[PDB]
Subunit: 256 residues, 5 copies
Amino acid sequence: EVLEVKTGVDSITEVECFLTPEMGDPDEHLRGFSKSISISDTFESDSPNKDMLPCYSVARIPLPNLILMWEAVTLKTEVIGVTTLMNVHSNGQATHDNGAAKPVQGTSFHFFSVGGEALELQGVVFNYRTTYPDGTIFPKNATVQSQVMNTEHKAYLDKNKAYPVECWVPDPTRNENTRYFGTLTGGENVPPVLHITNTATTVLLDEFGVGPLCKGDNLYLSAVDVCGMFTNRSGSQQWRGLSRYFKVQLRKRRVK
Amino acid sequence: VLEVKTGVDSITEVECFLTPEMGDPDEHLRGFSKSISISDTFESDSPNKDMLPCYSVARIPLPNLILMWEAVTLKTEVIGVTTLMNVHSNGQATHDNGAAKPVQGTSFHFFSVGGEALELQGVVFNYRTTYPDGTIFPKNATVQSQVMNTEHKAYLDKNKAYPVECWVPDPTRNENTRYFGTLTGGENVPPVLHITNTATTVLLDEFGVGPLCKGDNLYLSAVDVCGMFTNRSGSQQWRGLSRYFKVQLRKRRVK
Amino acid sequence: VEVLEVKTGVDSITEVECFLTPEMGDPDEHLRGFSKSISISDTFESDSPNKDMLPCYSVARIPLPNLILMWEAVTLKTEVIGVTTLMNVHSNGQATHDNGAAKPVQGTSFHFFSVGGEALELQGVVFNYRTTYPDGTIFPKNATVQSQVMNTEHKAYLDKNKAYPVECWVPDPTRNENTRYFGTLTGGENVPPVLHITNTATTVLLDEFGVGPLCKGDNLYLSAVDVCGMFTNRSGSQQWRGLSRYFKVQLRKRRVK
Amino acid sequence: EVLEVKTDSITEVECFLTPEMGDPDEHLRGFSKSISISDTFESDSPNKDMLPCYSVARIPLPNLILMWEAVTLKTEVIGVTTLMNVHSNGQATHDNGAAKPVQGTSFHFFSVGGEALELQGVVFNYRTTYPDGTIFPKNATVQSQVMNTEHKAYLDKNKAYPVECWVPDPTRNENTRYFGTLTGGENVPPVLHITNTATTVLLDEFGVGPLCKGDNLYLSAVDVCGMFTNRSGSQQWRGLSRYFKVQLRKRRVK
Amino acid sequence: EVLEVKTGVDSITEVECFLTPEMGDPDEHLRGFSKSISISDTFESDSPNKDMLPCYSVARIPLPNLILMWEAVTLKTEVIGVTTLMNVHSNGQATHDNGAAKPVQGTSFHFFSVGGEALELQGVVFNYRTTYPDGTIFPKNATVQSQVMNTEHKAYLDKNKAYPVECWVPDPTRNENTRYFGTLTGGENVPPVLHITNTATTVLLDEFGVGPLCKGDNLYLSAVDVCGMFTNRSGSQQWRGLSRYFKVQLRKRRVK
Ligand SMILES: CC(=O)N[C@H]1[C@H]([C@H](O)[C@H](O)CO)O[C@@](O)(C(=O)O)C[C@@H]1O
Ligand SMILES: CC(=O)N[C@H]1[C@H]([C@H](O)[C@H](O)CO)O[C@@](O)(C(=O)O)C[C@@H]1O
Ligand SMILES: CC(=O)N[C@H]1[C@H]([C@H](O)[C@H](O)CO)O[C@@](O)(C(=O)O)C[C@@H]1O
Ligand SMILES: [K+]
Ligand SMILES: [K+]
Ligand SMILES: [K+]
Ligand SMILES: [K+]
Ligand SMILES: [K+]
Ligand SMILES: [K+]
């Protein structure tokens, strides 16, 4: 039972943080990148290394200790460091003779969510015979049905650097206490289009004027910002990701 | 069509997912078509069944009820969009040492909510195409069938039977259904798939009346051909994904 | 026409529902919806396209119930019919690469429709004034080099089906007071078709003063072009492909003085 | 001081402006000369018939203190479907294919004002020598490649001001409304919408449209649709005419 | 605390100017261009020449001396010289035999801000081993974490032609007293799309009806307009920038 909002000086707070991307980090110099992508020799033998798999990011933010619950009302969010994609002068492959290096481009996924509990995930796999690596949490006992929808694959985004992007999505049958937004833009040559502004606000209230209600006084933020692939001189490609800023305004809400 | 009932018991909701029906050429390839082959002449076009994506449909029974369930709102979403980030599974490298070419090219994204079966009109790219045993296709195709032959009328009344390429929603009918679709062509067309649990489509017409569910049945239909997967060899297969539906319904009295 | 009040009553409304088939050239008895394959002249002076190679405007004059009262067109629902046919990539087209599917229909499109109370009015404009348009078409007569940009002599009525080639006529913006027209040319040879369908969208046909097209002689004029792109054969030869268009129009009786 | 609107009180301007693309010979109205490339910045010296220019018409209004105030505009590019001629000495896209359609860099621009469009000069390359019979930035310096405030002009002559070295001056033009889109890239496809159902309101944030000094309305346009490539591969700009219809009303001023 | 707006003919003022782009200016004939872009063999050896790095533009505009503050309320802005990109006859590379020159295209960054103090910057680098050149102001003591987010890299955009675009962005964790807008459009061949009009106004008021308040009676304007790359006959590529016009309206506001 959701009752009234509490007012007065004491009754609002705000959360401000950033989530780093988790692209795989194949060595000590390559934070924000994946390992270069290799292609299996057969469909059955698909078997990606952990460092080659971008994962969902998540942070659990503790809120001032409070029945009253913190209610998330608005979000401002922004991808951090968009201009880094203008470095086309290192380690790259020329577009044509004497040209600059091919920039980061191709498949992107940009995703973020704000909830009063962990994001709920449904497992779907491109190829059910893919062997996901040790160190990742992935759909277990995958069958051919898992290539389209196997309802056995439920999980919570409850751990950072763990849930690979390619085999999990937000579960649309759950997540009543979360708001989520994502865009997959495919193709090998698609250009990144990245907007920044400190003037845009998303309102998190549902159809009844109620935002996510924070259980245990924790706010859950989740994100993926795979911007595309970087291409080395050899032609090998590595995913590149960026950090995401969150600012969330919250108010106290009485419940029963 | 009279008034809406109110009160605790007067609303219900349907929540489900429709699986895609892309052809399923073997026991490992659910969600995929058979690789596509090209006829040697225009006249000799003869696609195999496993190579033809078909419309999906589910009839959802509603609480037994003159009142009729009226579909009012819809939330819908393509499920498993991130699978298209698998570019390491024996695809064809974009260039020497590159990652695999992702799923791309021609897509059809379509969904409908009705109080009866979606009504279909048959149109063919090529009237001499021999559609295969086990599909339901425009019968007695003439050259006029390439643009409009009003004989080709059907109901989307069976799963994995109606090929996407030779049927569309009949604009001359479907008064009790709401449909939406986008065909995006070209072989290099990039998929653009959005997800969110914050978007609702209102199903009410210009008089504030939604689809009215005959016999207490809700009809959901879909196609989500996302593009084609290219194998190492160059062969291509349609790839489809599931669609989530959530529909809100209220009891409406009628005479 | 001084326009006066709308008439009411069960008797006072009617609707028109039909489809216009595309007129792409139809080069033989198996190729309804296609043009002849396209060939290119070696000079501007030798441009002489065959009729079967030229897409034309579609038109239908629809008789309305006989009636001073006039039928006033108020709303339109319209839809391109058969959009999913473009998923046929297995019918002797040209493989995009070794072992791949056939290149789908793509490239230059023109999607156009109008609703009016009289024939659509046309202005002739030509890419190349020395193009000789063929017998059996209606085209800009006495073309001069000024016809490549604007020659006010080239006025016509879309008063005949499969006759007015798309490429040399457009709706005349200096006229057409009693018609509503809408069109998009999307160029480029690799341009992907984007075709939306739905039965929930309505276009209101009333002007800034709340008046829609008034049907002279109790006729409603519907016009369309839906050139979807080009189909590429295995040989590399290319043919325009078109699709039919559905129209549903609501009309009401309007008194005029 | 702008005062009340009069309520005889309205008039309408209807016309078209032809494109001015270069017109290299008597058969190529609407096209430019084929484009050639200087081998150095210093040697850039385009011929006039290779340079699209701004189009302008000064339209005299009924003699009238009252001024004509421009309130609404309807506008359209004329002949959009000519771009479907892919059978006329173009270059096949591939063996046995149709000709490459017009595509690549486009500039679509129109303005309505109560005086000549005010122009600022900016040049890609300050060492470009602009030809006789054109009006161009004079005394160009390297600063002219980004902003040289010396280059002020009025769009006061047709077939004269090259598109490439002039833009509307955003520091002036209070008495004009202008709108333009430059869509670059060599392969970019043209997207041309036509309809007779769209109106643009010309009033500013205070409810005042352009006021016609000396009872003249100034219409300006550029519609470079792209480049046509012929069978040899050479490329030439292709432009189209623009329709304007403008509603005006009489306004008293002090 | 923000109190009432002043009224009267004397209560408003306006600022009108342009910011020139700062692309590198490799010689006396190439204002508005960078130096040719080259590609270092490794991240380790990445060492961009100063003339090769586009920088942020900034101007500090003094306002009429004024407790009252000037409050920025509206902005009109425009890229100046968009039609220059139609010069495809000047020292370029023909797209195909006998064709015109390939126009300016590829990665673009269009950005502008209006504030009552210097734009606040956060350093993010594509590659932490990039050696930024003498004469630039850049993230100091970069580590591998600087490739995603390192909170030590805080700066003010307080100097023209000094802060490279590629290693700095607006700090979303600050800039309360500034409004900023930017778009990074990536890709090797992405076409420029440039709109111009004198009929569009951006409102600078925040959600409480308050615009940027000008400390010390100074308005801060910042911009980047990297339009793409110019490809010369050899195929070497240079960034090309254009100037940006600003018109800002301000009003007097009382504060305590
Ligand atoms: C940015 C970078 O470090 N590139 C290097 C990559 C990556 O380190 C690995 O691909 C990580 O998986 O390795 C190479 O052998 C290669 O693939 O060509 C050399 C190249 O310079
Ligand atoms: C995803 C998958 O199964 N791919 C395999 C395909 C398909 O099974 C068939 O094409 C179905 O028609 O078959 C191959 O022989 C091929 O065409 O190259 C091997 C390839 O790895
Ligand atoms: C759809 C179709 O019929 N395609 C066929 C075309 C057309 O009939 C003509 O081009 C009409 O002009 O004719 C061919 O000889 C060709 O050009 O390659 C064979 C091709 O399969
Ligand atoms: K495996
Ligand atoms: K057959
Ligand atoms: K001829
Ligand atoms: K010169
Ligand atoms: K000014
Ligand atoms: K270094």
